[PDB]
Amino acid sequence: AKLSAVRIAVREAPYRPSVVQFPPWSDGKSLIVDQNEFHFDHAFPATISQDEMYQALILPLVDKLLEGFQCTALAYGQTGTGKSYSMGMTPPGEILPEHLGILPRALGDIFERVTARQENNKDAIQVYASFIEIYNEKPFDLLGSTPHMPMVAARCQRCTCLPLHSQADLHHILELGTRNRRSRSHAIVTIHVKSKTHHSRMNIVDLAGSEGVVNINLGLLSINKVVMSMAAGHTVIPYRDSVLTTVLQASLTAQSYLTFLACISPHQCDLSETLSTLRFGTSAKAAALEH
């Protein structure tokens, strides 16, 4: 079948004249770059805080995750545009409160709802985290004993999930994974919600820089093909088109959720990279149709 929802958001990175224009009159989901008009589900200016961005874009997915639906939030775009910052890939301990990203905020709300529903509980719920890195189209388990050893025919499921009981634990897995981490390197930190009969995932994806100079991009790219193939029901999904779509195969299924976060530079010198990132958003936006 089709995914439950495919959403696309854009976040303007802080300015160091911005090429990004937010029209005086708009629905808050539009922007203009190099005279081109872009329309997505969310358009966040450089002034949007982490809290607001998380509340608008990710918080809604928390209930879905708890209900058993697979969820994926993926940041993409040029290096230095705030992808890691937005997703919260840096160990929480060494981060100021207002700067905390999506990962720590999501985990916080997950624990809260799990503790609030652990009495009108059917079964018990346990939370875990996995940290996978894709270096040159090769999956690596950053939480295992061989973080520098490629995976095959098992990166889809067989990969260490470490227990999560508090933010401190998240800090541990992020610190551990970061150390065991080694010309593109993508990161996929997944919050796993497991019960005796259910397993839902919240995949927080932080892709490597999309700038140029199979083709650097290709994942997400491959992601759009997957989204389309499912809609038109090609009765064969190109999951193996890339390591990204292979690792997230279990999450790229019917009544799963996919949310894109395009991070863009407001600098004129990055116009070309920004346009590339926004054009991809438009394409993923069209592929999200029929879903």
Ligand X SMILES: Nc1ncnc2c1ncn2[C@@H]1O[C@H](COP(=O)(O)OP(=O)(O)O)[C@@H](O)[C@H]1O
Binding-site residue set for ATP = 77-84
Specify the residue for token string 């958001």: 9
SS3 183: coil
With CB under 5 to 8 Å by kind, the binding choice for 282 among ligand X, Mg ion, none is none
User: What is the β-pairing status of strands 199-206 and 185-194?
Assistant: antiparallel
| 247: nearest Cα among 211, 289, 207 | 207
Kindly identify the residues of this chain, within the stretch 241-280, that bind ligand X according to CB under 6 A: 263
* Nearer CB in complex with Mg ion: 62/100: 100
Got the DSSP string for 209-222?
Answer: P------S--HHHH
Q: How far apart are CA 136 and CA 279, in angstroms?
A: 24
Of 94 and 119, CB closest to ligand X: 94
Q: Which residues belong to the annotated binding site?
A: 77-84
**Minimum separation from the CB atom of position 240 to Mg ion (A):** 26
**150: DSSP letter:** B
Q: Which residue is nearest to Mg ion (CB)?
A: 84
* Window 195-234: contact mask with ligand X (x via CB under 6 A): ----------------------------------------
Question: Shortest approach of ligand X to residue 219 CB, angstroms?
Answer: 15
Supply the minimum distance, in Å, between the C-beta of residue 103 and Mg ion: 13
The residues in 58-117 that bind ligand X, with binding defined as CB under 6 A, are 79-85
Question: What is the total count of residues that contact ligand X (CB under 6 A)?
Answer: 10
* CB 82, min distance to ligand X, A: 3
> Burial of 277 by CB count in 10 Å (0-12 exposed, 13-18 middle, 19+ buried)?
buried
- Helix (H/G/I), strand (E/B), else coil: 187: strand
Determine if 13 is a binding residue for ligand X (CB under 6 A): yes
- Structure-token match 């990204």, residue found: 244
* Residues contributing to the site for Mg ion (CB under 5 A): 83-84
State the burial class of residue 249 (Cβ atoms within 10 Å of its Cβ: 0-12, 13-18, 19+): middle
List all residues 6 or more positions away from 35 whose beta carbon is below 8 Å from its beta carbon. none
Q: Minimum CB separation from ligand X for residue 80, in Å?
A: 5
Residues that bind ligand X (CB under 6 A): 13-14, 79-85, 263
